[PDB]
Amino acid sequence: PEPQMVLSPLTSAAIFLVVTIDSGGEDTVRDLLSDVASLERAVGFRAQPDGRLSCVTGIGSEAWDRLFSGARPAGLHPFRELDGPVHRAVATPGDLLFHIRASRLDLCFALATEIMGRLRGAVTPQDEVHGFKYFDERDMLGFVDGTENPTGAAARRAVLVGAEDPAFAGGSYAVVQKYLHDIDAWEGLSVEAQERVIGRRKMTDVELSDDVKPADSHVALTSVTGPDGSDLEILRDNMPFGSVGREEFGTYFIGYARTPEVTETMLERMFLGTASAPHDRILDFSTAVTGSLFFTPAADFLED
Amino acid sequence: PEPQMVLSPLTSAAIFLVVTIDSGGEDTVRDLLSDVASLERAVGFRAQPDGRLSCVTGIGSEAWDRLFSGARPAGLHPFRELDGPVHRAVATPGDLLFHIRASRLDLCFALATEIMGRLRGAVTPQDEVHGFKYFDERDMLGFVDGTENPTGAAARRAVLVGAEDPAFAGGSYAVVQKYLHDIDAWEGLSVEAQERVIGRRKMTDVELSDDVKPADSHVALTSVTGPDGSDLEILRDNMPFGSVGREEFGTYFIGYARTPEVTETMLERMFLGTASAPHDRILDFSTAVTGSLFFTPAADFLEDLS
Amino acid sequence: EPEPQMVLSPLTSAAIFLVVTIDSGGEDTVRDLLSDVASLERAVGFRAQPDGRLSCVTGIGSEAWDRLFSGARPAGLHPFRELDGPVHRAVATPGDLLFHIRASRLDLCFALATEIMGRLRGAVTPQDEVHGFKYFDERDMLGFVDGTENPTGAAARRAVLVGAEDPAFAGGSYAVVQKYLHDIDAWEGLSVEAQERVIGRRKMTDVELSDDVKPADSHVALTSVTGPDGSDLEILRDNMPFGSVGREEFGTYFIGYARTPEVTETMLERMFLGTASAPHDRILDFSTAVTGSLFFTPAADFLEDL
Amino acid sequence: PEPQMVLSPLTSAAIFLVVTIDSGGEDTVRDLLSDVASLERAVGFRAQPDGRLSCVTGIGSEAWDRLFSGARPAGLHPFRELDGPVHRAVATPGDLLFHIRASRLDLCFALATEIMGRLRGAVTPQDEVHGFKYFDERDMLGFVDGTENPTGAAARRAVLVGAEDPAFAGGSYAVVQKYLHDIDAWEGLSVEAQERVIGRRKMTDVELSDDVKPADSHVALTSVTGPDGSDLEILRDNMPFGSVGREEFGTYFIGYARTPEVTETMLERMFLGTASAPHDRILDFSTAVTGSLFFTPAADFLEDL
Amino acid sequence: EPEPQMVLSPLTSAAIFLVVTIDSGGEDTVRDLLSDVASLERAVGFRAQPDGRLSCVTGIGSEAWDRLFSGARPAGLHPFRELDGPVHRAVATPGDLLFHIRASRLDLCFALATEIMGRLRGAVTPQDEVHGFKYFDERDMLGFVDGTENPTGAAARRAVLVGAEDPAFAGGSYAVVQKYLHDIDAWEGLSVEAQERVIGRRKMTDVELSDDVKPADSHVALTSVTGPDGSDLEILRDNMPFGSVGREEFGTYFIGYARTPEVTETMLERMFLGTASAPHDRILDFSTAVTGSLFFTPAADFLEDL
Amino acid sequence: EPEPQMVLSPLTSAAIFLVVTIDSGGEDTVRDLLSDVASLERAVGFRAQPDGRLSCVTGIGSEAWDRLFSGARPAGLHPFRELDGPVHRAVATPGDLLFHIRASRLDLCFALATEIMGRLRGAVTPQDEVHGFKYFDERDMLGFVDGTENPTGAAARRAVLVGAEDPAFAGGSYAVVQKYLHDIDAWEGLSVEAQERVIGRRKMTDVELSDDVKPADSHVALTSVTGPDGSDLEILRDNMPFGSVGREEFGTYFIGYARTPEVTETMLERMFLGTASAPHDRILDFSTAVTGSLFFTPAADFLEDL
Numbered sequence A: 001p002e003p004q005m006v007l008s009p010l011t012s013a014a015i016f017l018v019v020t021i022d023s024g025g026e027d028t029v030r031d032l033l034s035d036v037a038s039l040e041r042a043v044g045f046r047a048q049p050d051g052r053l054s055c056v057t058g059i060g061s062e063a064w065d066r067l068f069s070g071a072r073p074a075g076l077h078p079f080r081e082l083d084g085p086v087h088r089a090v091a092t093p094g095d096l097l098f099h100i101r102a103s104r105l106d107l108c109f110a111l112a113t114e115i116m117g118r119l120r121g122a123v124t125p126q127d128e129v130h131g132f133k134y135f136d137e138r139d140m141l142g143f144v145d146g147t148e149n150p151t152g153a154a155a156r157r158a159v160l161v162g163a164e165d166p167a168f169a170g171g172s173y174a175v176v177q178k179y180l181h182d183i184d185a186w187e188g189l190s191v192e193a194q195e196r197v198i199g200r201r202k203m204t205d206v207e208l209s210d211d212v213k214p215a216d217s218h219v220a221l222t223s224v225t226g227p228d229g230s231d232l233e234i235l236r237d238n239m240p241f242g243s244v245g246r247e248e249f250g251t252y253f254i255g256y257a258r259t260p261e262v263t264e265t266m267l268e269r270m271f272l273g274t275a276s277a278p279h280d281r282i283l284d285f286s287t288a289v290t291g292s293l294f295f296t297p298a299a300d301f302l303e304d
Numbered sequence B: 001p002e003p004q005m006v007l008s009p010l011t012s013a014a015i016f017l018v019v020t021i022d023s024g025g026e027d028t029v030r031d032l033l034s035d036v037a038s039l040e041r042a043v044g045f046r047a048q049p050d051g052r053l054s055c056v057t058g059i060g061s062e063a064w065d066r067l068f069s070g071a072r073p074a075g076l077h078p079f080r081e082l083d084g085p086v087h088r089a090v091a092t093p094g095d096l097l098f099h100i101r102a103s104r105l106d107l108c109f110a111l112a113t114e115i116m117g118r119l120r121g122a123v124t125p126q127d128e129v130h131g132f133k134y135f136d137e138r139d140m141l142g143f144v145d146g147t148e149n150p151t152g153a154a155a156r157r158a159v160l161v162g163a164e165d166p167a168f169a170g171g172s173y174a175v176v177q178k179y180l181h182d183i184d185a186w187e188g189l190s191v192e193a194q195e196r197v198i199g200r201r202k203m204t205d206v207e208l209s210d211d212v213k214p215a216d217s218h219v220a221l222t223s224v225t226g227p228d229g230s231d232l233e234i235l236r237d238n239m240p241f242g243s244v245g246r247e248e249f250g251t252y253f254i255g256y257a258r259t260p261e262v263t264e265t266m267l268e269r270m271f272l273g274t275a276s277a278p279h280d281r282i283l284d285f286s287t288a289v290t291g292s293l294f295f296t297p298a299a300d301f302l303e304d305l306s
Numbered sequence C, E, F: 001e002p003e004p005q006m007v008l009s010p011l012t013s014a015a016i017f018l019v020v021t022i023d024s025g026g027e028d029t030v031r032d033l034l035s036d037v038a039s040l041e042r043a044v045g046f047r048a049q050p051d052g053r054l055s056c057v058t059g060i061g062s063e064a065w066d067r068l069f070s071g072a073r074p075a076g077l078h079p080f081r082e083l084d085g086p087v088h089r090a091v092a093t094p095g096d097l098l099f100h101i102r103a104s105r106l107d108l109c110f111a112l113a114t115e116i117m118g119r120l121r122g123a124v125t126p127q128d129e130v131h132g133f134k135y136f137d138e139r140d141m142l143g144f145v146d147g148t149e150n151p152t153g154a155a156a157r158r159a160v161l162v163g164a165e166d167p168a169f170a171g172g173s174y175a176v177v178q179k180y181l182h183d184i185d186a187w188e189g190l191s192v193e194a195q196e197r198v199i200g201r202r203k204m205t206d207v208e209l210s211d212d213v214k215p216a217d218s219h220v221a222l223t224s225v226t227g228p229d230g231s232d233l234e235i236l237r238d239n240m241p242f243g244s245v246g247r248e249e250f251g252t253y254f255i256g257y258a259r260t261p262e263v264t265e266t267m268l269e270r271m272f273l274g275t276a277s278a279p280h281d282r283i284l285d286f287s288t289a290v291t292g293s294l295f296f297t298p299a300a301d302f303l304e305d306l
Numbered sequence D: 001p002e003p004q005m006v007l008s009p010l011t012s013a014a015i016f017l018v019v020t021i022d023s024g025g026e027d028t029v030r031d032l033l034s035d036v037a038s039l040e041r042a043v044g045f046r047a048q049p050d051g052r053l054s055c056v057t058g059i060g061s062e063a064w065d066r067l068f069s070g071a072r073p074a075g076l077h078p079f080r081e082l083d084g085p086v087h088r089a090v091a092t093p094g095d096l097l098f099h100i101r102a103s104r105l106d107l108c109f110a111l112a113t114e115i116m117g118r119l120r121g122a123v124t125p126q127d128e129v130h131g132f133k134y135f136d137e138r139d140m141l142g143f144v145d146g147t148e149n150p151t152g153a154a155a156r157r158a159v160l161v162g163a164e165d166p167a168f169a170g171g172s173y174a175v176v177q178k179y180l181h182d183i184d185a186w187e188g189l190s191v192e193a194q195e196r197v198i199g200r201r202k203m204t205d206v207e208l209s210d211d212v213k214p215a216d217s218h219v220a221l222t223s224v225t226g227p228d229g230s231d232l233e234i235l236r237d238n239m240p241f242g243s244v245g246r247e248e249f250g251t252y253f254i255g256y257a258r259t260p261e262v263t264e265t266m267l268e269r270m271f272l273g274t275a276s277a278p279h280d281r282i283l284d285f286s287t288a289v290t291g292s293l294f295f296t297p298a299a300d301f302l303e304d305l
């Protein structure tokens, strides 16, 4: 089975589109789903090989039941709100996700235009974010972002549904959250205090040794080991976004995994805390304003 | 005198920032102006040679009088509203323009962040547009945009103030208008009818011959000759922008010229018409929602400030 | 595991197509060249890596095969079959060897072609030589994007490489070539909308026409074929513009690769002879075939080991 | 005055088009001349900054008198045949030259298509050559080609008409010749013998010193000093071309200079020789089959027609 | 299932070769660094992706292996074997660890080497450090293209990676290094044709000499070796120029990877000790080896699991 | 109009600095090489255009000038002046000729240095050879961006080229070189904020510290100088990192060009001897100079006409 382009080369631009399906809009949606791969080629082919355009399409739990009869993917459920003692992960509505990536924003915008053109009258937009990466892979906090993502065979194993749910093999699960940052408070920390929040050196991107790394650092809390002592991994493609006039400085988080359990365990540790950590210190400078969960089927599923 | 980077190499990203200066904000603004070149180097130097980051700073007519106490540039005045029989060119507030360009949006954003950091508390944002060019220099209407811009020595002559106003030599005048398009109506025209609106072939960008080119086409109305029969020229760096969710598809127009009279004559022809043309047909699919005029001084003028 | 030739190439912007016939007595010289052609490709190309992207695919015709080799023949190898339609004809022309040479620059193609023909002088007669160039936005001589629906990845390997159905020749492929001349004057008299009806896709945006508006005799409708089991039958194409402005020759060199020639031949029958709903492919009313040949392109190992 | 793009950045592709103007063709030609800069922007702008498309337009001596009334450029005359003891530089017909350059052949071809589309029925093609440079600036003989071209202000001085002919300031003179090579004979020389023909090392492109450089080497014969002892220079943009099936391996020579006398002195030395050299040894492996001379006006001259 | 180190790297234009010995008592510090070297590679390289192309291949010598690890040894691991020929000698020099660092720029190599050696200060003693650079047309210091006949694709994986013959160490490889210094004055006194007879290929065009003119003592003849079954035995090389113009040091750093050391060692025997028809490889009359070491480069998983 | 050497070069990522002394009797050989060095630069560089960006700036020391030439000398040419401060010393070391070779790749630098040294063998003795590389974000070995406040355009030409104050030598410049080694272990024991107080700029973002926090003994404060008339006195720098990981050598090669040595020497006095408010430049607490030389770089025409 052929996956969607979940494992994409590095891109410097992205559009995230989240919509809800209006009553009566089901048929229009199903037709667009069967054409989205053809639209990706149409927009992208003439800008190859530099364009690097791809579109990953995801479907939410409630939407799935409205669109399709028969089997559901085993891990598909609505995003679970987390009400921590200090920080909250909100659940917000979303039926479809389009994760559009390329080397330039214009290509993203052209594909998004064709997709939304086909869905006019059948969907209501909930979120639209135009992201850009900094030229040295840094995010809005000034840290390199993406370093420990798995690659090659380890990425496929971490991200693609396999034999445990054979009808849906080659799919994946995406979690999205839009975060806004308090840059004024962040810039009041010394660089060394910032390093203790994240768990890595700022300039050189070397991980802090186990004797200095705090238990409530981002990297400590999002490091999880399975029963067999192996690392449980996700693939992230976080993107800065913002607006200088409205003082909006953000990170759009997106994490792909073979089962939502891995991502959800990381979120629980961050937001609810553990015995050794009250919460993830990154949350003292970062507020989540959306949260949604989607299944991203194999490309062949959509082509039917 | 050293000009600002009005004549930039081609760039694929831009931020347009327009602000008003709040009462009491003048001193903070004057300080920022004397540092803006240093900020451009700070952000841009480490991303050379590919980043191509530049910032052009413009000052409005009413702002100039609040900031500076001596001579005024000869052509600086508030943008003039045009009330045509069908179409209107509105005047909207703006005291400062930052026209930021680079090969990537992140560099534009980083410079804009440092600029606005210094001005917080002293200014109020009026407009912020993040522009992106299509990979084959096309605009949102699907036409190549930029082709007849002047280059080289002809660009310098058309754009930079010279001997006619010697205290302000090396400056320029910028006009900005944000346009929103009705794409549904535009896409209901055949290609040939679109070509009659613009005045050039869509796929190949070859200008229509003089015996087919309508008098109310964009190219006919923006072609102006001087007293001596020479072409009057401006330098444009129009950028697409928009939001697919809100159905906003735009062109941000910016035109630089040695004197505003050239740009204003073109706007009069577009909006008020001529003997042979009621108005520019591009305006039947394009609405202006801002309009402002700025003087962009020589770099030396900004540096030598308090 | 048998190694294919570079049938599945990255995108290239230049090509040379060379078709020759083998003279009487030339067989031994040809066999020696075949055993060296991959070594020549590395010699010319390696020092221009990684940007040169030089490759050569070598093909052998049906009659040539029997003169060169004893033993088994590939199961689908036969001479190209003439199609005599009510209006349009697909001609068969002679050719014993094909060299399909691609790179990012014409000079590299020319240097490899020079070494190959240097070795074959006196043993072969040239039948056709075409120097092809792709337009910068993947467009062909008709102004349409060309290549869009080619298969990629695993689907390309499945569509193009001989496998278990003919195990001695696994890793080979079949190439069909046709040189087309276009009537550009007639083509350019069509509106863009009428050109879109001929091809089956939008010209500027390369979006396929919806199934209810796509004509039955459009290029895309007739070259879309489904198998016994209702799966899409695919080929890999790398069509190249060519021509000469002084002689008014404006062409497309067609080359199509497939695991069996039946798929390509079915598409040709539909184009030239028509179906119940379509007399012929409308692209043929602006395009004349002046060559036609079929070749087997063996696995690289097959050529090396003789 | 704004020159044409005679001083171009380096390009790896070119089309050379030479045509003659038929009976009655003059009006159609003058219309095209007034549009050719606008055509160049139309084709090229959307492929910037990588495309690097330019077109330099030239007009021959006889054509000048048919197209324009009034002043003629001072140095404009028909190409002068040189019938030397062994080698000949032929003259062939040509009224208009279009020298089209870009980073890719397709852009050259697109501009040539629009130009010839406008001239159909008014002109007869005499030559069409599609040129390609090798990836390390080498020519068909395997030597680096271009090295001692002038650059910057020295190029402008060597190439652009100035005060000596003020009505035509910003123009230039182009000489073209199509050369075919005998590759078999060339490749039978050792590398060291080839180096003595050219006057430079093959691999490293270092000039042979004055004590080893033969008097009949290409570099010795095309090195000329003026009355003042200063170097007389031209700007060249030679391109390989050919066809493997027909065994055609060529160099298309094009040389620009402020006055044709510089280029003509070099041609005399190559074909007629000097006291110490019978002829340029490059000519024992290279045959000229075309020869024409053109004036390339300032861009504003063409625009104002 | 085993993940190899980046032995099969894309082409790179810069490299650092670091060879060190492990001091008495340094074993624990070395084991800790080995378990982190892939994490360090990502730390330095990720922010320069995708163009940085940074990789590190780590190798371990025979005597070092027994100091670091208990249990199984790779079947072909032994100290480099000195070859004392009648004229030329291949010396063995000490080395416990190899770090073969490659990228598209030297600064990335240098930054990773700095982090690695920072961790190992006090536990290791440096024996050699070479900063290599590519010529722009893949030439070495002798003026010949270097790398042409290296295997690619599936043939490279088969030639280089340990498989089922030693399943505990599958996905590893064996590296041989030798630093060579050239006598450039003697070399440049030869005619180009005499240089071609030393190497076995044409200098400018890199075309291999035909079998009847290629000398038996040419480099290409002696390093072409066929197995019992008549198949070509191959290695992967990534030779790098280095040197210092003031000290007149012009070198080639030789590095060859193979699935078993016997292939590399057979080539070395032929070069240094000769055959019945060739006393030695003529390249050695202009090239002196000043180092020689053999290393096993484990699968990436083996290093991670420490 | 006198043609300068390529002092104002585009940005380069690689360099070779070569400093030699002229042996007794070597004068004639040197004069011949000087008259050929521009021809050699084109020979090596032309075939790598337009990306190679190869250039060579040749400098002559005070004592060498008097050995090579008769007549008038440039007005500011003297041996480098030793500075003996209370804590820190600037040493003077021998050097008669400087070759400052820059390009986009090291191999081009190396090839030109090889040709230059080939012509001088037996006439000169090498004193220093450094192969420099820039970090990918223009950072130096201290981790700060390096070059940001260099002048550009017309302001650079005014700062660096001799003019009417010494008209026989117009178009020349003066270069000062110092090789610095850093104590990285001590430097890395500072916090980022303490490092920023040493340099005078923010580490990550390269924004200059405000005048109210910038210490008087920071690098940027001490190297900022105004003339009597209030104008900025500027130099043009092209500092390059270099080093060797095995020897723990981490360096910055300093080179500064100026129209008169007085500007450079005033900055050096402030750094090494201090001012009223600053004992010395804090950068020197982590940086030791081990070479120091001064050269005049003539106009290109001067070298050609020898």
Ligand code: HEM
Pocket (backbone or CB within 6 Å): A139, A141, A143, A144, A145, A146, A147, A148, A149, A177, A179, A198, A200, A218, A219, A222, A223, A234, A236, A238, A251, A253, A255, A263, A266, A267, A282, A286
């Ligand atoms: C405000 C939102 C976020 C920001 C700015 C952020 C930024 C970063 C940074 C700078 C790193 C270190 C470099 C790297 O390996 O990528 C990192 C690592 C990581 N983040 Fe985040 N992150 C955010 C949210 C999240 C969330 C919500 C999750 C999971 C549900 C997550 C999971 C991870 C994981 C797994 C790693 C790798 C840890 C390791 O194994 O070293 N992050 N993040």
Ligand code: HEM
Pocket (backbone or CB within 6 Å): B139, B141, B143, B144, B145, B146, B147, B148, B149, B177, B179, B198, B200, B218, B219, B222, B223, B234, B236, B238, B251, B253, B255, B263, B266, B267, B282, B286
């Ligand atoms: C919706 C707003 C606009 C759009 C989309 C737009 C688009 C275009 C296009 C496609 C062309 C032809 C290609 C080229 O030469 O650039 C053009 C030309 C031009 N436009 Fe605009 N334009 C707009 C507004 C304006 C305004 C407000 C002015 C002047 C005040 C202006 C002045 C010009 C000029 C001078 C030309 C060149 C005409 C020539 O000399 O051939 N445009 N525009």
Ligand code: HEM
Pocket (backbone or CB within 6 Å): C140, C142, C144, C145, C146, C147, C148, C149, C150, C178, C180, C199, C201, C219, C220, C223, C224, C235, C237, C239, C252, C254, C256, C264, C267, C268, C283, C287
């Ligand atoms: C004059 C010659 C030709 C021209 C200019 C040409 C042009 C094109 C163009 C513009 C397309 C649409 C975009 C794309 O998918 O590539 C296309 C598609 C196609 N052409 Fe051609 N074509 C030519 C001849 C042929 C011939 C001879 C064949 C088969 C024997 C062929 C088979 C196809 C196929 C299979 C497709 C894809 C249809 C689909 O699945 O969507 N074409 N061609």
Ligand code: HEM
Pocket (backbone or CB within 6 Å): D139, D141, D143, D144, D145, D146, D147, D148, D149, D177, D179, D198, D200, D218, D219, D222, D223, D234, D236, D238, D251, D253, D255, D263, D266, D267, D282, D286
């Ligand atoms: C027959 C085909 C021709 C070939 C293949 C050819 C090739 C070359 C080569 C390899 C060089 C040396 C590198 C360089 O400086 O460009 C050169 C230099 C030169 N060629 Fe040609 N050339 C040809 C015809 C001509 C003609 C017809 C002329 C003049 C009318 C000419 C004038 C020159 C000049 C002036 C130089 C520069 C000499 C100097 O100052 O060093 N060449 N040529």
Ligand code: HEM
Pocket (backbone or CB within 6 Å): E140, E142, E144, E145, E146, E147, E148, E149, E150, E178, E180, E199, E201, E219, E220, E223, E224, E235, E237, E239, E252, E254, E256, E264, E267, E268, E283, E287
């Ligand atoms: C001074 C040291 C060396 C130099 C400059 C050098 C240079 C070259 C050159 C120029 C080639 C021809 C083109 C090619 O790379 O395919 C070549 C081929 C080769 N060299 Fe070396 N080499 C050296 C040492 C070695 C050593 C020590 C070995 C083996 C232990 C070796 C093995 C090979 C092999 C296997 C080939 C490929 C031959 C074939 O099958 O075509 N080389 N070398």
